[PDB]
Curated annotation (Swiss-Prot):
Other notes: Present with 1990 molecules/cell in log phase SD medium.
Post-translational modification summary for this protein: Methylated by HMT1.
Residue intervals of the RRM domain: 20-95
KO phenotype (gene knockout): Sensitive to boron and hydrogen peroxide. Decreases cell population growth.
Native source species: Saccharomyces cerevisiae (strain ATCC 204508 / S288c) (Baker's yeast)
Lineage: Eukaryota, Fungi, Dikarya, Ascomycota, Saccharomycotina
Localization annotation: Cytoplasm; Nucleus; Cytoplasm, P-body; Cytoplasm, Stress granule
S-S bridge residues: none
Protein name: Serine/arginine (SR)-type shuttling mRNA binding protein HRB1
Function: Binds to intron-containing transcripts and is involved in quality control for the export of spliced mRNAs from the nucleus. Binds to pre-mRNAs until splicing is completed or until faulty mRNAs are degraded. On correctly spliced mRNAs, GBP2 and HRB1 recruit MEX67 to allow nuclear export. On faulty mRNAs, GBP2 and HRB1 associate with the TRAMP complex that guides those pre-mRNAs to the exosome for degradation.
Length: 95
């Protein structure tokens, strides 16, 4: 008896839960740590951003540090793909 039957199951889960830091590899080479600070820190608190270097070789990439280990990811969910001075930032987590 019966025909065309089916079955499936689902769950919610997370991984790699550690650190308080983030990296950005495709932003504008004119960006300052202050430009990333006023951007990211609307979520809560950036404690440090970094982009400018003493050698200055046109790098186009930098780092940001938060007070948080989960809301720091909830930031990126709203900012990865941001066209930023016409040039699209893309984010990588710490490790």
């Amino acid at each position: 008896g019966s025909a065309r039957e089916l079955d499936s199951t689902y769950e919610e889960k997370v991984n790699r839960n550690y650190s308080n830091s983030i990296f950005v590899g495709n932003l504008t080479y004119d960006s300052t740590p202050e430009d990333l600070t006023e951007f990211f820190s609307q979520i809560g608190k950036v404690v440090r951003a970094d982009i400018i270097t003493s050698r200055g070789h046109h790098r186009g990439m930098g780092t940001v540090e938060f007070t948080n280990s989960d809301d720091v990811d909830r930031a990126i969910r709203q900012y990865d793909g941001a066209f930023f001075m016409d040039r699209k930032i893309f984010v990588r987590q710490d490790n």
